[PDB]
Design a protein around this motif. Structure first.
Motif, PDB file in Angstrom:
ATOM      1  N   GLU A 131      -8.290  -9.793   1.074  1.00  0.00           N
ATOM      2  CA  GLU A 131      -7.281  -8.974   1.729  1.00  0.00           C
ATOM      3  C   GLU A 131      -7.148  -7.597   1.104  1.00  0.00           C
ATOM      4  O   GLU A 131      -6.370  -6.779   1.604  1.00  0.00           O
ATOM      5  N   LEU A 161      -2.685 -11.020  11.490  1.00  0.00           N
ATOM      6  CA  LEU A 161      -3.807 -11.688  10.838  1.00  0.00           C
ATOM      7  C   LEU A 161      -3.670 -13.203  10.920  1.00  0.00           C
ATOM      8  O   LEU A 161      -4.648 -13.917  11.192  1.00  0.00           O
ATOM      9  N   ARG A 163      -7.601 -14.812  11.003  1.00  0.00           N
ATOM     10  CA  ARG A 163      -8.384 -14.290   9.889  1.00  0.00           C
ATOM     11  C   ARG A 163      -7.741 -14.558   8.539  1.00  0.00           C
ATOM     12  O   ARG A 163      -8.378 -14.304   7.511  1.00  0.00           O
TER      13      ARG A 163
END
Ligand code: ZN
Ligand code: ZN
Lengths: 241, 209, 284, 117, 234, 348
Positions: free
Chosen positions: A111, E159, E164
């Motif tokens: 991330e 997300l 993901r």
């Protein structure tokens, strides 16, 4: 009530009541330390002093590829080389510099974020730093700790030497432990070969009433739990006075 | 969807014939067990065109004990049967002086039609059935034991033997699928014969409500 | 497997690879370059109301894998769409020879594009290409257990357990399923006692409930005398309706206020008894 | 085909909605706040990939090679630079059931090559 | 992600000042379940009993242009999946195009009745300045910081909705905190010190109302703190 | 070998050489194969341990006696503790793709997933210990949770059937006097005296059924061996006895058909009040019956005695047709079993 994987080293897997509070009432592990809390102002000043850009100064176009940086959950800014940034923050924590040992520093890579925490209540435990596939705890450290009563060389000096590090549950996700120094050796098939920390002793995963059990690794776990519950009911000398 | 329509129509007619035979109406064996080919040969295989039309499937059977006690089975063409269609059937039943009929709806039936079926209940006991529930004879299922509608005399003998009132027997809803199949009303008692692993055979009696 | 396909609910989304809305002003020159081959084969003559045509075009692409797995054809899909949406939505499609199955849809005549998107979202799910609703998935297998095997009496009078294909559905649509070709309407059953009571009857649900209880108890290998189960089932099926073993089934019968208060809703039961001046016969 | 991107107005930077020129029968993207218009260039206004044909190689990033918890292997060298060592990991992403496929990344610095076997 | 709820995914944030305002203003940013044109994103703000689409919140924070909003939510305009997932909320909340209208909307949804739009708007403005994400900042001119954080919250929700990212585990102790004697006694001491200042306020008020001085030694009811800590620990 | 097989399965899965089995997802298939291998390995190791056990082994002594323990216990003490399962699945990745920080991400190996390869006597490695503790936790929670629901269920059952009882007329009625069952258990029998038995005229084929139940009264040699001279001559000469025997066989055949319909499956096991086999065995012992000598019990007497006994056995009393039908149905199964067991040919 289930024993989550993240209770490893932070809580006793055996010590828990067997009544209507199974799994809810827990017991800290021997080397588990709950963080006390610290001010993030020095960390924020260090981050600003480095190449981090504040959140109001940047343009949204720069947030795509850049790495986000949070401090106690507050998004402060972004950075360009999070690898060397984390390496620097870790060197400071290992040198007892601006960053104190109780501070957590988790770098999520997928991330692209760097969560820094100074909050209180973060359960953490000490671990031996492993640099290549070798421990930073050399023999001179054991020597000084053996003569601990003379040279006043204590655990604090061991931590300040950058040999030990306080790792919290959230950073264990990004930490690769070596159960024992035997795992750091070269084997016919290398399992990890990139360890970054090591366990002081696996028995430290047990709590207080579970540490008294002899050969607890040879008993069915329910039995270890019932013993952790009865050791508190056993007679003895509860206190000298 | 025509070979399937005629197949459904044949299955529904077979189920209706079995129902009338179980209710005690005179149904010949040939029509009781009519193959799909025989049905197509006697009625046709193009219901979409109108051969056979659902009006041609109308059945009229007579009780084995009483020949004048007839029974109708109508297959309305409109999916949702309306009050006007109920009035048409009521007119035909009034003309032929018949007191029992079955309306085999396709989709369902309007509230006004239901209200007509309940208000006209004492004069003409006409029932409703969905073709979806007539495509199978539930009485042949393994879970459904053998039901038998008892006669008022047999019920009197039952109550006199076991020395109990009607309200003391177990109950069966008037809307129960088997109660609808046998066409039983409030106050009637149905004898159920079921196999038992402890006694071999067990006979119970249910009162309709 | 054919029966399984005819029973297992299938929606357009299951066989739909993707969908796209284009502003195609003239079909003669489709924006897409692969549909051009057949679009002309269809528009060479005026088959529909070309005047009442909309430039907005809904083009859906299907996938061979699923299409074959369900033995579904473009003709069938087109007919289902035309049936559900009437003639207002014109639907053309290519034959099952192109490497990609694509059908085009236009609206005859909220904005047109908005409506097209709405109906696209609705059709992907609602439209039932085949199968019976409520049945998400069907499992086909050979029952290894004799209890589930078809036991038959041979001419010599010997019990023989024929291991035949059996289907286990994840949904319950007894009503429709029993009325299906090649489906045995005698043995086929459901574990949903509510469904059994609704379709078969009170006696059938009594039997089904007994079976369910027996299966639950025997699963771990425990044994209970049949009489106990029979008595419980009779208690739950003695009033012609499914009397649940709860306050909603025990306090709703004419058992007297005292017993109901002993069970649950003490104050409410006594309060209602007082209001209706009920009399407890002191039999319980 | 590819997805269809949002077009923003040049005056108020609001989203442009699709609309048709009834007289000229041409696709335009017009602003719902001001009176701006644009001549469309794709002719497609909506695309939904139900099959979800996503190439996870685009989701993977070279920075994952710096993760010490990931396994490394010497059997699959990098084809872009020839480096031997490479980390491999699963998709571990929802909406991808066949996640047992392995995705490799080159551990060499400045390479960040990603691939799949 | 709650299996049985009107929302598919919910991104929450129990927000609290770094070292003050112990009550943790919980803010939710949920996504409506697919079951309607698209999936709408809303936000259950504190002191408001009605969900509000995120776009109104962003406009109420001073970011009116939809491009600015997307720049705060989606950081990569090259992600058409992201634009397609955020489009329904935008199309659902577009009639509002000014900060005052957005603030009035919030004030109309606020728990407090909007007797006057002016008070109503001010009610909201102060709610979005004090109650929404206090850990990010309660001072003025920080609407940019709050907008960025709420944008990141929406980014996280997207997300998760696109898969993901993995959903967060409620049992992960890295996501938990242990309130020890320190923070517990601190919470009690804060509430009790507040009660003490309250009693001292009333005392001094009813004395100055008579036009005379008051003695803080007599106003300070030390029994409050003493007996309070004693009762709690007892 | 087990771990090697798991590695090969993982390798195929990574190389996309594993196709999902029908009706199962690829990941489910992988888990099924891995669990299969682990379970088979556990079973083989355990079996080896038991076979290694000597007659003097105390674990073996207790397990064989059934006093305490089981072969599984012996296999976890002497061989392999086994795989630890949480929520009926291998240890989940509590961390980011890792069960424990000691392992690597996307590691599905037996150790990482909690396959305790050590036995209790050998000792468990720390990770194995933690996973085993997880499984123990699961068991403890289940034990501490099921109690409340089970208690509530028991309470509801009691409140719903506390008043149902057997009345003096032998029918089961509730407090309201509503008839729940005409006869308790559909047979009006107690639940203690009844015991397991087997029907001898259910599974047997027609040929075996006849060869075993039709009394053969034409084989003079067989009659001579089984029965005494007087009985043999009476049976051969008198035609009334032969006709009665034939009627009895016909009745048994009809009962056989009834048993077939009552039991679609071929399960002869049934709970009946009297264990006829045991009673006959007792009679033999008490009267020192010698099986190698011709019996003096006349078959006609056997038939008459069975019919008389059947009439005496009455669950429902009453000569009216309704009562006698209820009685016949009540005792049908027991009467069929009685006739089958007390068959004249079997008794001869
Ligand atoms: Zn504009
Ligand atoms: Zn490379």
């Amino acid at each position: 009530r289930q024993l989550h994987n993240t209770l490893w080293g932070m809580v006793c897997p055996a010590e828990t009541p067997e009544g209507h509070a199974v799994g809810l009432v827990k017991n800290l592990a021997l080397m588990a330390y709950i963080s006390v809390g610290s001010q993030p102002s020095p960390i924020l000043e260090f981050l600003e002093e480095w190449s981090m850009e504040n959140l109001e100064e940047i343009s949204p176009a720069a947030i795509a590829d850049a790495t986000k940086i949070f401090v106690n959950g507050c998004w402060v800014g972004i950075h360009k080389d999070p690898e060397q940034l984390m390496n620097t923050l870790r060197k400071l924590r290992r040198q007892m510099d601006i960053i104190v040992s109780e501070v957590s520093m988790i770098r999520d890579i997928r991330e692209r974020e760097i969560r820094i925490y100074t909050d209180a209540g973060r359960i953490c435990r000490p671990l031996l730093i492993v640099e290549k596939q070798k421990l930073l705890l050399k023999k001179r450290h054991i020597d000084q700790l053996k003569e601990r009563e003379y040279n006043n060389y204590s655990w604090q000096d061991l931590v300040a030497s950058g040999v030990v590090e306080y790792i919290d549950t959230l950073e264990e996700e990004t930490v690769m432990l070596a159960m024992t120094p035997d795992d750091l050796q070269e084997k016919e098939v290398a399992y990890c070969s990139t360890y970054t920390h090591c366990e002081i002793h696996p028995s430290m995963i047990l709590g207080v009433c579970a540490s008294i059990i002899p050969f607890p690794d040879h008993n069915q776990s329910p039995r270890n739990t019932y013993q952790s519950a009865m050791g508190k009911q056993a007679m003895g000398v509860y206190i000298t006075n | 969807d025509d070979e399937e329509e005629t197949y459904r129509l044949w299955k529904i007619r077979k189920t209706i014939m079995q129902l009338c035979h179980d209710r005690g109406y005179l149904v010949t064996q040939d029509e009781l067990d009519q193959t799909l080919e025989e049905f197509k040969a006697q009625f046709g295989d193009k219901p979409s065109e109108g051969r056979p039309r659902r009006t041609d499937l109308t059945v009229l059977v007579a009780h084995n004990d009483d020949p004048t006690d007839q029974m109708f089975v109508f297959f309305p063409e409109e999916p949702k049967v309306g009050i006007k269609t109920i009035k048409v059937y009521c007119q035909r039943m009034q003309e032929e002086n018949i007191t029992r009929a079955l309306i085999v709806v396709q989709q369902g039936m309007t509230p006004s039609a239901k209200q007509s079926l309940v208000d006209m209940a004492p004069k003409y006991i006409l029932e409703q059935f969905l073709q979806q529930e007539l495509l199978i004879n539930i009485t042949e299922h393994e879970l459904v034991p053998e039901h038998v509608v008892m006669t008022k005399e047999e019920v009197t003998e039952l109550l006199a033997r076991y020395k109990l009132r009607e309200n003391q027997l177990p109950r069966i809803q008037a809307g129960d699928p088997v109660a609808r199949y046998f066409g039983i009303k409030r106050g009637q008692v149905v004898k159920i014969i079921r196999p038992s692993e402890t006694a071999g055979r067990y006979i119970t009696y249910r009162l309709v409500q | 497997k054919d029966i399984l396909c005819r029973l297992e609910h299938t929606t357009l989304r299951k066989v739909t690879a993707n969908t796209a809305i284009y502003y195609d002003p003239n079909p003669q020159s489709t924006v897409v370059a692969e549909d051009q081959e057949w679009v002309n084969v269809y528009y060479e003559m005026p088959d529909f109301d070309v005047a009442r045509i909309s430039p907005w075009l809904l083009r859906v692409e299907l996938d061979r894998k699923h299409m074959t797995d369900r033995k579904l054809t473009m003709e069938q899909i087109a007919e289902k769409i035309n049936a559900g949406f009437g003639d207002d939505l014109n639907c053309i499609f290519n034959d099952d020879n192109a490497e990609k199955l694509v059908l085009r849809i236009r609206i005859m005549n909220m904005d047109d594009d908005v409506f097209l998107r709405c109906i696209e979202s609705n059709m992907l799910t609602d439209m039932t290409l085949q199968g019976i609703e409520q049945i998400s998935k069907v499992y086909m297998h050979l029952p290894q257990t004799d209890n589930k095997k078809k036991i038959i009496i041979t001419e010599d009078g010997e019990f023989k357990a024929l291991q035949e294909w059996i289907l286990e559905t994840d949904g319950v649509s007894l009503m429709r399923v029993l009325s299906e070709k090649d489906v045995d309407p005698v043995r086929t059953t459901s574990n949903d006692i509510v469904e059994i009571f609704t379709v078969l009857g009170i006696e059938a649900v009594r039997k089904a409930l007994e079976r369910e209880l027996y299966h639950v108890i025997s699963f771990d290998g425990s044994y209970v005398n049949y009489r106990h189960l029979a008595l419980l089932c009779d208690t739950m099926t003695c009033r012609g309706h499914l009397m649940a073993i709860t306050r909603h089934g025990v306090n709703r019968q004419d058992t007297g206020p005292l017993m109901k208060c002993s069970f649950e809703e003490t104050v409410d039961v006594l309060m209602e008894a007082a209001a209706h001046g009920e009399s407890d016969p002191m039999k319980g | 085909p590819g997805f269809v991107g949002i077009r923003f107005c040049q005056e108020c930077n609001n989203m442009l909605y699709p609309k048709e020129d009834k007289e000229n029968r041409i696709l335009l993207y017009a602003c719902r706040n001001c009176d701006y218009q644009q001549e469309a260039d794709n002719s497609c206004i909506y695309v939904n990939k139900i099959t979800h044909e996503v190439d996870e190689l685009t989701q993977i990033i070279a920075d994952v090679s710096q993760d010490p918890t990931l396994p490394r292997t010497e059997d699959h060298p990098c084809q872009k630079c020839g480096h031997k060592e490479a980390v491999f990991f699963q998709s571990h992403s929802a909406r991808a059931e066949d996640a047992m496929r392995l995705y490799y990344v080159c551990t060499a610095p400045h390479c960040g090559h990603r691939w799949t076997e | 992600a709650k299996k049985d709820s009107k929302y598919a995914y919910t991104g929450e944030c129990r927000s609290c000042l770094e070292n003050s305002s112990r009550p943790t203003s919980t803010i939710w940013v949920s996504m409506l379940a697919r079951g309607a044109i698209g999936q709408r994103i809303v936000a259950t703000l504190p002191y408001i009993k009605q969900e509000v689409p995120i776009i109104i919140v962003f406009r109420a924070l001073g970011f009116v242009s939809d491009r600015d909003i997307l720049e705060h939510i989606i950081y990569d305009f090259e992600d058409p999946e992201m634009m397609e997932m955020v489009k329904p909320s935008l199309d659902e909340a577009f009639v509002i195009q000014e900060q005052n209208v957005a603030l009035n909307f919030i004030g109309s949804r606020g728990a407090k009745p909007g007797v006057t739009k002016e008070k109503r708007i001010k009610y909201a403005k102060e709610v979005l300045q004090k109650e929404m994400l206090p850990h990010v900042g309660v001072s003025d001119f920080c609407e940019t910081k709050k907008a960025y954080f709420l944008g990141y919250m929406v980014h996280r929700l997207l997300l998760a909705a696109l898969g993901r990212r993995e959903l967060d585990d409620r049992d992960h102790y890295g996501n938990k905190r242990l309130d020890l004697a320190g923070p517990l006694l601190a919470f009690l001491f804060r509430g009790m010190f507040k009660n003490l200042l309250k009693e001292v306020r009333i005392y001094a008020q009813k004395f100055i109302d008579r036009g005379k001085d008051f003695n803080l030694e007599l106003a300070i009811k030390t029994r409050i703190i003493s007996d309070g800590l004693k009762y709690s620990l007892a | 070998k087990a771990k090697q097989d798991v590695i090969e399965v993982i390798e195929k899965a990574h190389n996309n050489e594993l196709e999902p089995t029908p009706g199962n997802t690829l990941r489910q298939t992988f888990e099924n194969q891995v669990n299969r291998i682990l379970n088979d390995a556990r079973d083989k190791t355990g079996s080896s341990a038991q076979k290694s056990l000597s007659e003097y082994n105390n674990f073996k002594s207790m397990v064989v006696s059934g006093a305490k323990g089981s072969k599984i216990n012996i296999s976890q003490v002497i061989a392999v503790v086994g795989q630890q399962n949480v929520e009926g699945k291998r240890i989940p990745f509590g961390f980011k793709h890792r069960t424990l920080p000691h392992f690597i991400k996307d590691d599905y190996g037996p150790e990482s997933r909690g396959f305790v390869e050590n036995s209790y006597l050998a000792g468990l490695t720390p990770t194995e210990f933690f996973f085993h503790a997880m499984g123990g936790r699961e068991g403890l929670i289940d034990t501490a949770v099921k109690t409340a629901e089970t208690g509530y269920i028991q309470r509801r059952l009691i409140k719903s059937m506390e008043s149902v009882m057997v009345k003096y007329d032998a029918t089961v009625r509730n407090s309201i006097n509503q008839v729940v069952q005409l006869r308790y258990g559909e047979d009006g029998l107690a639940g203690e005296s009844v015991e397991f038995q087997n029907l001898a005229t259910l599974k047997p084929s027609n040929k075996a059924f006849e060869k075993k139940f039709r009394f053969d009264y034409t084989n003079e040699r067989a009659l001579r061996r089984t029965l005494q001279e007087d009985l043999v001559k009476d049976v051969l000469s008198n035609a009334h006895i032969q006709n009665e025997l034939e009627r009895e066989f016909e009745r048994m055949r009809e009962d056989r058909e009834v048993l077939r319909v009552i039991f679609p499956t071929g399960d002869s096991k049934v709970v009946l009040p009297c264990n006829l086999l045991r009673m006959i065995w007792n009679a033999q012992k008490i009267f020192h019956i010698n099986p190698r000598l011709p019996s003096d019990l006349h078959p006609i007497k056997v038939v008459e005695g069975v019919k008389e006994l059947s009439k005496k056995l009455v669950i429902v009393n009453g000569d009216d047709p309704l009562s006698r039908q209820a009685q016949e149905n009540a005792t049908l199964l027991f009467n069929i079993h009685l006739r089958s067991t007390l068959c004249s040919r079997r008794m001869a």
